[PDB]
Symmetry: D3
Subunit: 162 residues, 6 copies
Amino acid sequence: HMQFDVTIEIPKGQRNKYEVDHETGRVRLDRYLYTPMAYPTDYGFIEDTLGDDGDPLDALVLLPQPVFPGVLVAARPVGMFRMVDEHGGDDKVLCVPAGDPRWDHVQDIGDVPAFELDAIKHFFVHYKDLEPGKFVKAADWVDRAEAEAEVQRSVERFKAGT
Amino acid sequence: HMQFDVTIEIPKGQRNKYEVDHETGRVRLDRYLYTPMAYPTDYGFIEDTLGDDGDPLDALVLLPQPVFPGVLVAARPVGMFRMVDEHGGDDKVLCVPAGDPRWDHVQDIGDVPAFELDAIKHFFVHYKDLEPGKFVKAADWVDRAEAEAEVQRSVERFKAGT
Amino acid sequence: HMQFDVTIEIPKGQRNKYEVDHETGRVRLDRYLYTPMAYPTDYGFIEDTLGDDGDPLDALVLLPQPVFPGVLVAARPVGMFRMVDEHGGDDKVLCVPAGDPRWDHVQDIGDVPAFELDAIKHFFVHYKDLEPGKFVKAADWVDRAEAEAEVQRSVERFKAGT
Amino acid sequence: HMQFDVTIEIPKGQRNKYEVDHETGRVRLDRYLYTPMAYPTDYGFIEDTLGDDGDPLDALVLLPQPVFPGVLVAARPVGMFRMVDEHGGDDKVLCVPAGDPRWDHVQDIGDVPAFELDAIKHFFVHYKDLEPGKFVKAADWVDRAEAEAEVQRSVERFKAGT
Amino acid sequence: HMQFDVTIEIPKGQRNKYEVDHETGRVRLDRYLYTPMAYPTDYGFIEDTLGDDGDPLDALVLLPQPVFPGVLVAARPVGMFRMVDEHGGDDKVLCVPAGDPRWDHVQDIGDVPAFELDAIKHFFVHYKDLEPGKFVKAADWVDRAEAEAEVQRSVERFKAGT
Amino acid sequence: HMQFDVTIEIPKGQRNKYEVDHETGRVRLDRYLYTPMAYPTDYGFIEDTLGDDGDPLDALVLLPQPVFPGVLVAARPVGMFRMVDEHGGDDKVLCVPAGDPRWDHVQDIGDVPAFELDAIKHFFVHYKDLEPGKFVKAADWVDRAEAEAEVQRSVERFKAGT
Ligand SMILES: [K+]
Ligand SMILES: [K+]
Ligand SMILES: [K+]
Ligand SMILES: [K+]
Ligand SMILES: [K+]
Ligand SMILES: [K+]
Ligand SMILES: [K+]
Ligand SMILES: [K+]
Ligand SMILES: [K+]
Ligand SMILES: [K+]
Ligand SMILES: [K+]
Ligand SMILES: [K+]
């Protein structure tokens, strides 16, 4: 039942860390990563959400082929990666394409292979290893119901801000 | 004499079916194709046109190297692929870059090799084979004069809507 | 238990049809396909096998990332695509990487999603549509036990020829 | 101290000459180059600048990995390529990523290897060789202080126009 | 009637100059080019030929999609680029795929557009501009009959050497 | 003065771990890495060397553009990464292209930026994090003189084995 639009900022396999400027919609290169790592899934954020830090809620989308920075994908949540960085919580909703029967076997976090979840976790735990003052901690996976609650509160924050 | 701007949605060689949202201009992933096929030419639509279905008129552009989703190319028509899908007519104007003398040998539909036209037709006839309820029929090639008439009526519809 | 080496001739996503010359080991471009299609999986043949036609037994390998023409991959069979072309039988063994626990969930043909099997079938049924005199018919999927029997007989033929 | 945003129009290695339309922000294919050449660095323009010809000031950005057309990169100048074409001056500011310590060794034009500067010059001197009526002349490298003066005047022109 | 096998050393679009070692068959990186140029066509040599300098006769092959270094392509000649470098003659036979009806319109040098021939010439005239002591001169196009004579003499030299 | 040939097995940016079989020369896929990491430089081994474990001595080559698996590059050493894995020593010689003046500024280990050396180290320290029983320890950089001594002993071992 829940679905939303994700804007992918960074396709799977990138060492260039792109970000959308949420005031203008422009794509920016934030930085080239300092570690020999690459985003493990397409990565971006959920449109029309607002986290407590004032940015949209982050999203990871499982896909058969990556998209390009800036592309929208209708998606549904199947779990969430809870984590903190140097600025506090920075959780990521894990998603699959909405309306696509090739993904109907993936409904909740236990439907994603551990090898894939462990590689995602490894990326976020280590990608900033060589950036002074930056880190990732308190990182773990939670289920779809918890992810949906996090999306819902972030939708509420967005609507309160309009 | 006739030329127009085409926005390419899908570069040649893609199995990701991108589409521009005509209200916002954003690029969206519609779907990953269900068949092991790839767009045979760069594919998109003609800016400032409106077909009867309320979307712009589709376009195919022959190029020496593909572009990226969302890129504009000034183009001129050399023929049209007439076809119907599950929603009725969904014709495509075949184009070459405007103002480029490397394409001056291509003025009308007979100037495009049959192998290329037959591969284009094959794509549209088969790409939805594995999507239930979707199909393509009544598919054939027509000449530049017919293509230009179709563009002109779609320009008229666009202007009437403003 | 059964495993073998596959030489991949054609990575997933190719419209260039490469083939290894079995006398010299050289990679050759056989042809650019005439249809707007691309190999649905990495494709090649099983080393040290001989089919009745005097060529090695063909193989399809499911992978998380494609390889390059000429690369060896240790693989194990999970089923087979039976088909005939203009020259008679030309079956393909479907395989996954051997010794890799990320594939342990795939043991037999029912463990591969229908969407993937149907796309593979579609490729072989249609890729020669635009080549005169060439075709593919009598095409269907069989299980691992049948695939292993076909591999074994082809290993026997190879050894008899030495 | 000086930094600015560059919009990259053309990634390193491209023979497709993309340009941003400065009225709309859309990316357009200007042309496929007529020579067998490719942009030697990521290439674009400095946001919120206006040259005498009414377009923003051009920029070259040294990067470890190219970006995509339309991407913003915060950059700082280290020199400038002075040149004229068929329409007069068309200088390019040479830049490195701002705020990135991997580039702190590059502060002025003498910090860029001659092989790289000579390849950049070669590109602009020759890329239009096969376009009638188009050329590049009076081409040479100047230092950061001269580049910064050119940026500053172009920022002043931009602000006067608002 | 004449055809031969070409080994492609360098795909279209490369700035890495690969070469096959003719004693071992191994692919080597000769050098990264010093100019911001890229091979305009797939480039290599004709198997079982020997030029006067003791290397096989060079070949350019027109293709719809490039191959990989080391790949064989059955080809037929349609003309030749005569040129000299710092070591004397170093002519290139221009070819199209043999046995492929998509190329039947290309029989001789006048069937290749001037824009393509001029870009090929430009590449060889300029690619060594920034290499001291290296150059290309006396460069021009000749017809298929002249190309075939050059191939034939080089086949004769090869056979005399066995 | 010292130079040698390196066969690159794995281009920069790969998550596919290729290896050459030293008995046959064939390229094999060893495995897809289990971590979201990619080789930080082109990686392979020095031809005509033998380490104590019976395999050639490993090499890392700094390049402006990656090569393809199996390609030879004439190289010279500028330092070495000393490390141990689950099987003992598995050091890597760090190299630049031989005979190429664009690399003449890199003569010893202090001429390579720390950011690059630290990223290389990070790769080897972490790439097997998610493989049970596999690890990398005792990892550090040493100078050219030490690297050359290691190459020389491995050349001696190779020659003793013939
Ligand atoms: K966030
Ligand atoms: K850190
Ligand atoms: K339409
Ligand atoms: K259908
Ligand atoms: K076969
Ligand atoms: K057919
Ligand atoms: K300008
Ligand atoms: K010119
Ligand atoms: K030659
Ligand atoms: K020169
Ligand atoms: K080793
Ligand atoms: K481990």
